[PDB]
Swiss-Prot record, chain A:
Changing T397M: In SPH4; Philadelphia. This is Band 3 anion transport protein. Coiled coil: none annotated. Changing E27D: In NFLD+ antigen. N-glycosylated. Its main location: membrane. Detected in erythrocytes (at protein level). The chain holds residues 403 to 890 of 911 of the full protein. Residues 26-33, 75-83, 140-168, 222-261 are extracellular. Changing K149N: In TR(A) antigen.
Curated annotation (Swiss-Prot), chain B:
The chain holds residues 404 to 890 of 911 of the full protein. The gene is SLC4A1. Changing R243W: In SW(a+) antigen. Changing V154M: In WD(a) antigen. Changing A424D: In DRTA1; impairs expression at the cell membrane. This is Band 3 anion transport protein.
Length: 450, 456
């Protein structure tokens, strides 16, 4: 019936970010976790959340802040020479213990402390992170394969290209730009009125898969030029079988895990809990769902799969069946390796840039930043223009920009693990320091929770 | 002040001039190139500023003239003829037509051109621009294919004699970047950002800014080859071995046949039709300006420079005011003439940037086209049509049939252009004038014809 038709849209909207994030994770973590592990985690946790989750509307999947934390912890472990996949196991153990502690007491008291200020700053930071990662990957591609006059005839291609290649960088840039352009034009077409309504909504729903298909075909019919493709195992296998297996031994894989890190892995668990709580506040709003999500993440850390987040009677059962089918098909997607291996990473990074740009649409901070470059009489009819003065609004925006810059600097420094703590430090900034400068009347308008 | 006011119209008359000169050099095998077009534009600009009745009309080369030059070049290369020498007799017949117009006025032919023919002509020119841009891109990709292995011992003295590693992809990137930067600057012009003065200032110079950005982007890329614009050293012919300055009638290399010297009146009629119709689009007293332009073109054909047409150009887009316009036109024409001395700047401009500007002009010429609007309405549902008179008073399928007949006319014109008998393209265009006047009243009633084909 229509259930199988509704399954397809959820499947594609849950698969394209899944494969994109799997590629990004494989690049950042030296392929220690890749597309296969993320797909297996998404499938298993989706099945469990569909069978026994409180709110079926929540889809459990990987996200940007989790990727940033994984990159930061990988950098920390490679700086201190630690077993990263084994440290994640103790992170999961401490997350489970924190889940038990939250269950014992009441965790709904801290929900109301998060306001629009922190959420908007967090989303803007995530969008900037996406854009920066896309452009950094483009710069690395152009650095690895420079535009030279003469290239070597026969370079080794078994692990990867060992030298510069003629058309790799320019074609990668073309593929990224074309993917982004087609996705944006399909989004713009979705809100237009150029075809019949059913066709318009259908094509706009599948804009990302259509753009991906177009650009993969474009690179497919180009024969002799090399582009970096997605690394997918043929079966239900670990990406890097040389580094890790399936069950990660908590007492070290190669060398013995130190006791000091075994006891100090509670602080990274606190950071993970803060990140998941903030993204749930952004999306979900529920302590049962948080219970389930963090518990499944802690359990999956033991088997090497990553933790995820809650990104967003008969009808409830229909949602149960829909979620179960989407999770099962996401799990079976790893068996479709001949298709996934032909997808260039340039298309995936174009989709990454598209997501980063389109996450800025509903951001009031982004609109208020755009108001910096307009004359004062072009401001829209929003309550934070007529009720507050222009320079007060600009000062509010400047303080938010200063907070964003401090967060970016903290991310850049080697102490990038403490980014969730610095991010959550903005809550007492709004509750304590902002009332000193601004007035209450200005603050309710600039920080309205509607 | 005038010294700052002339700069905008200078750039808006120079960028299409260099683009058309490069493209004419490509299609014409450098019989006429950037040097000839620039010299013709300067001389005719001076002579039209000093003697023109209406100074607001700028004199310059355009798309229909380029299509006519292509068609005549193909006709001359098909037969045994010198292409540069037939243009001399075309100019002679044009001067004779100018002499024969002052006797019996042609003001009665002005009323016969309506919105139908003008809109069809503009749409055809836009499609021609887009097709030429994409054909050049396809030829670039064919000359330098994406291969696994390239031979790096290739001679580059006349041109690259073999495929190059990454020329085609960089050319495509440059074309796309130029087009997108020009479109984004146009969109910024009609926006609400920045102080208003600056918005109009940067929006006015969107094309020069996009050209500068992309030329710099290509300039800082060192080891990659891109095809650059061919500009001579100074006041020199583009191809010195071909024609020279004073091209000799009655044959340069071989004997020019008498039958062609007598039958060159038909191409003169076709080019006069093209110039007259483009001047009609420009307008929407005038006899003096039109005949002066045609006479200057006929005289310039004697020295090898191309003929030009008239276009409406304003400053934003009594005796003192007309005198200031005189001085402005003279200064702009003199500076366009002096622009040929900037070889180190003009030779570093890639042709990909100019073709991006060509695509930009082709796309942006479609903005005020009512035929384009009704083509866009072919896809919208009937409830989304705007409140224009040709929708409220005209049934939906009636105007769809009107647009379909116009599309059929456009397809016939395209087939004629692709046909080797492409010289007769303007005449077929004139066939759209009786079609509105004779056959359309048989199908549509008078009310729907007045609504769809509105005078203004
Ligand atoms: C070559 C093209 C020839 C076309 C000639 C024939 C063109 C022609 O006659 O239009 C009919 C059709 C739509 O007609 P039509 O209005 O009856 O279709 C829908 C109908 O009106 C619904 O009631 C509307 O919902 P609502 O009650 O308002 O809520 C809906 O609006 P939306 O809300 O869904 O937008 C409408 O789409 O449009 C095309 O086929 C585009 C073809 C492009 C392919
Ligand atoms: C870049 C180097 C120069 C920087 C100098 C920067 C100097 C600077 O700070 O200007 C700020 C200016 C303030 O606008 P502001 O209203 O004071 O200035 C204009 C004035 O109000 C006019 O009266 C308006 O015309 P009108 O009476 O309504 O008809 C005109 O609007 P428009 O009608 O013309 O649209 C206004 O632009 O605009 C920005 O905020 C953009 C800042 C982004 C920076
Ligand atoms: C969505 C559109 C985004 C466009 C952004 C382009 C990113 C380019 C990154 C260059 C990194 C770098 O500097 O690379 C350095 C390498 C050499 O490497 P090396 O000498 O070993 O160091 O230079 C090269 O061979 C390439 C020279 C730079 C080419 C830039 C092309 C820009 C096209 C712009 C189209 C709008
Ligand atoms: C808005 C700016 C323009 C955007 C459109 C670009 C059109 C490119 C035309 C390519 C076809 C062609 O030219 O293919 C012809 C060539 C030559 O083939 P050969 O075997 O040597 O032929 C010998 C006779 O094929 C190729 O080597 C394949 C080149 C494929 C390039 C694909 C680029 C995709 C760009 C997508 C941008 C969103
Ligand atoms: C797998 O892990 C080993 C050890 O960390 C590493 O050397 C290798 O590069 C990894 N594989 C890939 C494909 O990166
Ligand atoms: C100049 O003309 C000759 C003969 O027509 C032609 O072979 C040559 O290619 C032309 N020069 C250029 C630069 O095209």
């Amino acid at each position: 019936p229509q259930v199988l038709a509704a399954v397809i849209f959820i499947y594609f909207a849950a698969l394209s970010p899944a494969i994109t994030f799997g590629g990004l994770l494989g690049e950042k973590t030296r392929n220690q976790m890749g597309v296969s592990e993320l797909l297996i985690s998404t499938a298993v946790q989706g099945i469990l959340f569909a069978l026994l989750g409180a709110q079926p509307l929540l889809v459990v999947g990987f996200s940007g802040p989790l990727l940033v934390f994984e990159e930061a912890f990988f950098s920390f472990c490679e700086t201190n020479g630690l077993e990263y996949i084994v440290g994640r196991v103790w992170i999961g153990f401490w997350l489970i213990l924190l889940v038990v502690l939250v269950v014992a007491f009441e965790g709904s008291f801290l929900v109301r402390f998060i306001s629009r200020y922190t959420q908007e700053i967090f989303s803007f930071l995530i969008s900037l992170i996406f854009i920066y990662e896309t452009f950094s990957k483009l710069i690395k591609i152009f650095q690895d394969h420079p535009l030279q006059k003469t290239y070597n005839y026969n370079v080794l291609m078994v692990p990867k290209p060992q030298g510069p290649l003629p058309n790799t960088a320019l074609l990668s840039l073309v593929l990224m730009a074309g993917t982004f352009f087609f996705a944006m034009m399909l989004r713009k077409f979705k809100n237009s009125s150029y075809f019949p309504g059913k066709l318009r909504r259908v094509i706009g729903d599948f804009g990302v898969p259509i753009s991906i298909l177009i650009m993969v075909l474009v690179d497919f019919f180009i024969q002799d030029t090399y582009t970096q493709k997605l690394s997918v195992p043929d079966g239900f296998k670990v990406s890097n079988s040389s580094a890790r297996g399936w069950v990660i031994h908590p007492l070290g894989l190669r060398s013995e895990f130190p006791i000091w890190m075994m006891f100090a892995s509670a602080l990274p668990a606190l950071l993970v809990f803060i990140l998941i709580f903030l993204e749930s506040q952004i999306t979900t709003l529920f302590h049962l769902d948080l219970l389930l999500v963090v518990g499944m993440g802690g359990v999956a850390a033991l088997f090497g799969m990553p933790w995820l987040s809650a990104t967003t009677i008969q009808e409830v059962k229909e949602q149960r069946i829909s979620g179960l089918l989407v999770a099962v098909l996401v799990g079976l997607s790893i068996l479709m390796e001949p298709i996934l291996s032909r997808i260039p990473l340039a298309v995936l990074f174009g989709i990454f840039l598209y997501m980063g740009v389109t996450s800025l649409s509903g951001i009031q901070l982004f609109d208020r930043i755009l108001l910096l470059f307009k004359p004062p009489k072009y401001h829209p009819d929003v309550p934070y223009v007529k009720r507050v003065k222009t320079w007060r609004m600009h000062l509010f925006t400047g303080i938010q920009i200063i907070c964003l810059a401090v967060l970016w600097v903290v991310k850049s420094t080697p102490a990038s693990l403490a980014l969730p703590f610095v991010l959550i430090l903005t809550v007492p900034l709004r509750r304590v320091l902002l009332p000193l400068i601004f007035r209450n009347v200005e603050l309710q308008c600039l920080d309205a929770d509607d």
